[PDB]
Write a protein that binds this ligand. Structure first.
Ligand SMILES: Nc1ncnc2c1ncn2[C@@H]1O[C@H](COP(=O)(O)OP(=O)(O)O)[C@@H](O)[C@H]1O
Ligand SMILES: Nc1ncnc2c1ncn2[C@@H]1O[C@H](COP(=O)(O)OP(=O)(O)O)[C@@H](O)[C@H]1O
Ligand SMILES: COCCCCCNC(=O)CCNC(=O)[C@H](O)C(C)(C)COP(=O)(O)O
Ligand SMILES: COCCCCCNC(=O)CCNC(=O)[C@H](O)C(C)(C)COP(=O)(O)O
Ligand SMILES: [Mg+2]
Ligand SMILES: [Mg+2]
Lengths: 269, 269
């Protein structure tokens, strides 16, 4: 069997040892072409575009809701990778961002936000005219956010501030103080990644506090080829007294979960 | 006496009936010029740039921390305007955004984020080259976000989604699906206001849930001349089962609070 998580931007495919593959959601027809060349008895599907695959191929399919599939696959990966966490927030930073509290037994969605990988690509395109994901993310890595973002220390100056001075006070809030600066593509893109990372993290640490867990597990393809994003998120998570976890193949959590859920759907009473 | 909240972008001045005035923080020297033409016995100061005013003029001054000054002024304005709220979140959407829980007696800061008025101006400048605040905000009001923002309904298509289809899934996440669109200045600016409003609101409703209040009071100068921002925030607050409140002269809460705190600082035992 095959597990497929057909998301808003990427289609994640898991073949069973696991073989991992991705395809762009825009190229969903090419996934169907690939499937038609395999010897597959059943599709285990999840994600927003699961229905599009199912209706376009004659292989029997079963669909699972992404939140439960992602939680189940993530729980499997965490254990494989040596983590025995009692509870955690997980933040699925996909095309958009979905936040979940896992209490040790099951997941509940506790929030979400439109700041995620889609914004990185879209706002990154508006600021740089780069459409290629590897080019965009590579360009951002070494950007300097200092002429773009305002820190608390910039507002309070010689007065000791009421919250730590190094914190971002206003994303893009320094632009009007640097109107003669060279706002390079790298610098602008670093600031896009900065705001996305800071928003995701802020929401994750807030729901971590609300649900009384110190653990925050970050998954999603948005971290791929984006070490800057991983650092923005890791650093701020630690600053706010929580423990960040990244997961090898975590972006395939849903696909793994779909396979697992299909397998255990069979029972009787 | 005079109350002055010298913030990151605007200096809010209250003279006592109240007279309200603003000046750009960049023009802080002109506030000092104005002060030197008045007959003022004492300055009641708050905000990040309070120290700059105090060190540049010979009028006796007392400084108050903005969070307590804002809370106190807001509590005064709410009562003046007929609201007797038992508790509430207040979201101070200034150059950046600071979030507070007021339990009926005092405030505590419960979060914050760099998505606020500074981002509107800075990212708005990067996308439109407009520096004038009235021009920028006026241009945004009637922008169409539909080719820029991705909704849940766009990902899930003919499948009923696990969360409501009209929700923003990814700010700027539709850009790559509309690469031949005319991304007009109005449309781009509406999307900037959209992401700021949605992030602020998301954080406000999350801490409202955490601290068990249905009331969210929004203050800050970021709402001035920005009906779109007010609508984005109001609508999403209501959708998430909370009650939004806007306050006449709410952006002057800190200045009013500074005057009040100075007046009642005098006591003995
Ligand atoms: N090869 C790639 N092409 C396009 N986007 C990519 C790629 N690798 C990583 N990404 C990033 O990952 C995001 C998608 O994350 P993912 O978790 O797969 O979301 P979804 O389930 O919505 O498809 C993209 O918006 C982009 O930021
Ligand atoms: N006349 C104006 N000039 C510049 N910005 C304005 C003006 N009116 C409203 N704003 C908006 O209000 C924001 C500042 O809000 P405010 O609550 O005064 O913050 P601060 O206390 O940091 O100065 C600006 O970033 C901008 O979005
Ligand atoms: C009108 O909209 C007001 C603001 C809504 C803000 C909150 N938005 C959300 O919670 C949706 C965020 N996005 C997500 O949760 C995900 O992108 C999903 C829609 C679940 C789709 O999953 P994926 O394709 O993996 O990103
Ligand atoms: C390194 O930074 C990591 C991310 C930090 C994100 C959180 N940032 C914050 O909480 C600061 C948000 N901004 C604010 O609270 C306000 O702008 C203040 C700094 C209090 C200044 O007040 P004002 O001038 O009125 O906006
Ligand atoms: Mg996904
Ligand atoms: Mg302020």
């Amino acid at each position: 069997k095959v597990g497929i998580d057909a998301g808003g931007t990427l289609i994640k495919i898991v073949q069973e040892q696991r073989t991992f593959k991705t395809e762009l959601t825009k190229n969903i027809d090419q996934v169907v072409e690939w499937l038609n060349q395999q010897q597959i008895e059943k599709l285990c599907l999840t994600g927003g575009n699961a229905g599009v695959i199912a209706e376009n191929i004659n292989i029997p399919a079963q669909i699972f809701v992404e939140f439960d599939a992602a939680s189940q696959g993530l729980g499997i990966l965490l254990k494989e990778q040596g983590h025995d966490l009692a509870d955690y927030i997980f933040a699925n930073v996909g095309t958009g961002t979905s936040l979940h509290y896992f209490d040790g037994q099951s997941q509940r969605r506790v929030g979400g936000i439109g700041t995620g990988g889609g914004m990185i690509q879209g706002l990154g395109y508006l600021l740089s005219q780069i459409t290629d994901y590897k080019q965009l993310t590579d360009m951002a890595q070494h950007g300097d956010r200092n002429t773009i973002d305002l820190k608390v220390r910039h507002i309070y100056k010689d007065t000791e501030p009421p919250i730590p001075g190094d914190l971002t006070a206003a994303n893009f809030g320094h632009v009007l103080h640097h109107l003669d600066a060279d706002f390079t593509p790298s610098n602008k893109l670093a600031a896009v990644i900065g705001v996305v990372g800071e928003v995701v993290t802020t929401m994750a640490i807030t729901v971590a506090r609300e649900f009384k867990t110190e653990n925050i597990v970050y998954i999603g393809s948005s971290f791929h080829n984006n070490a800057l994003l991983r650092k923005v998120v890791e650093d701020y998570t630690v600053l706010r007294g929580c423990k960040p976890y990244y997961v090898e193949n975590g972006a395939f959590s849903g696909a793994i979960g779909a396979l697992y859920l299909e397998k255990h759907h069979h029972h009787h009473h």
